[PDB]
């Protein structure tokens, strides 16, 4: 819900082109009582209670809650035998056929989230292997969240990647107050 | 717009067996877009109903209305198509089984009253349905005499039994 911008917009009884004078006298004729056209009760008017302009559902959760959610997702993926730790994500020839055959032989499922680290330090074999499939994805260690993990069935990490995740999740515990944003150089925090 | 009455003349039946009756014929025919009223057409249909085709033609030839000649021509062309295509040899061995009227597409016009107001002139249109069946016409249902009423009353008094117990 934090990336939702509803562009739905409907005009009311004032923005509709039309309706100015008074159609028929109220006391004269014996018709219904009306003062102007282009009303929500007439045909061709505006919406009474509808979407008015773009509605933004922007709201942020605490950083500690998000870190705890990441840790909980990791524990869920580890307990249900859906977390395979690797040492070096490399392929001998780099092809989707060998990749899906290995995935089916090692019993993983219909989907698996492959996570590397530092983005730039990624070999070309696995990149070319995943660039031809839909279920296989290659995201860096920073672009790891919860929806991508819950959407897939298993998760694949690496020793430096899992170490980075562990230290980034433990940095939230035993720290100081925010006071000012962490984008500053600080002294101990890089 | 729906048209399902003119297509009933194409229902093909399987060949019968020598141990089966003759089975009378069924001829369907109707016209569309007729400048007339549905009430008068229904009155004419009620005047016809189940009678002979020759008697119907005779009654329509001396009927002082607008749709009388229309229904006469409809019956004539239906009998012609029956004796030419529906395999009918006798021209006087026919009788109308079903005869009703419908409603046609209508428009809107003005009436012009005696002030700024007006009316909605709706062009009334109707149709006419008729079915021809071969063989002699069936006799009308005779009225039940006192014997039938007496027998029915005896049956009703004999059918009643004990109620509200066992």
């Amino acid at each position: 819900n934090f990336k939702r911008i509803s562009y739905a917009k409907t005009k009311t009884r004032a923005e509709v082109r039309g309706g100015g004078r008074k159609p028929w006298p109220q006391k004269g004729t014996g018709r219904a009582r009306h003062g102007s056209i282009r009303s929500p009760l007439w045909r061709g008017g505006g919406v009474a209670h509808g979407p008015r302009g773009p509605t933004s559902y922007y709201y942020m959760l605490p950083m500690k809650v998000r870190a705890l959610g990441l840790k909980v997702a990791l524990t869920v993926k580890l307990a249900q035998d859906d977390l395979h730790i690797m040492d070096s994500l490399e392929l001998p020839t780099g092809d989707p056929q060998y990749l899906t055959e290995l995935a089916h032989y090692r019993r993983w499922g219909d989907s698996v989230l492959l996570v590397d680290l530092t983005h730039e330090e990624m070999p070309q074999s696995i990149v070319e292997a995943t660039s031809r499939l839909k279920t296989f994805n290659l995201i860096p260690a920073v672009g790891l969240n919860v929806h991508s993990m819950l959407k897939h069935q298993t998760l694949v990490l690496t020793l430096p990647t899992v170490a980075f995740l562990e230290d980034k999740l433990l940095w939230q515990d035993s720290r100081y107050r925010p006071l000012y944003p962490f984008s500053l150089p600080y002294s101990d925090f890089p | 717009i729906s048209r399902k009455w003119e297509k009933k003349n194409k229902i093909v039946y399987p060949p019968q067996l020598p141990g089966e009756p003759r089975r009378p014929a069924e001829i369907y025919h109707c016209r569309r877009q007729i400048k007339y009223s549905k009430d008068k057409m229904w009155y004419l249909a009620k005047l016809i109903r189940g009678m002979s085709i020759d008697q119907a033609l005779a009654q329509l030839e001396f009927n002082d209305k607008k749709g009388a000649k229309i229904i006469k021509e409809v019956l004539l062309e239906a009998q012609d198509m029956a004796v030419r295509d529906h395999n009918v040899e006798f021209r006087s061995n026919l009788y109308i089984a079903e005869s009703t009227s419908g409603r046609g597409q209508c428009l809107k016009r003005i009436r012009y009253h005696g002030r700024g107001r007006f009316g909605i002139m709706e062009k009334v249109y109707c149709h006419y349905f008729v079915k021809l069946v071969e063989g002699p016409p069936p006799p009308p249902e005779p009225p039940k005499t006192a014997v039938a009423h007496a027998k029915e009353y005896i049956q009703q008094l004999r059918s009643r039994t004990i109620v509200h117990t066992l």
């Binding site: 006391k27 004269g28 004729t29 | 002030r115 700024g116």
Partner: peptide, 14 residues
């Protein structure tokens, strides 16, 4: 006073 209301004519499309 002399109260009176003028009639309204419908468009010539109906």
């Amino acid at each position: 006073k002399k109260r009176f209301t003028p009639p309204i004519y419908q468009p010539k499309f109906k």
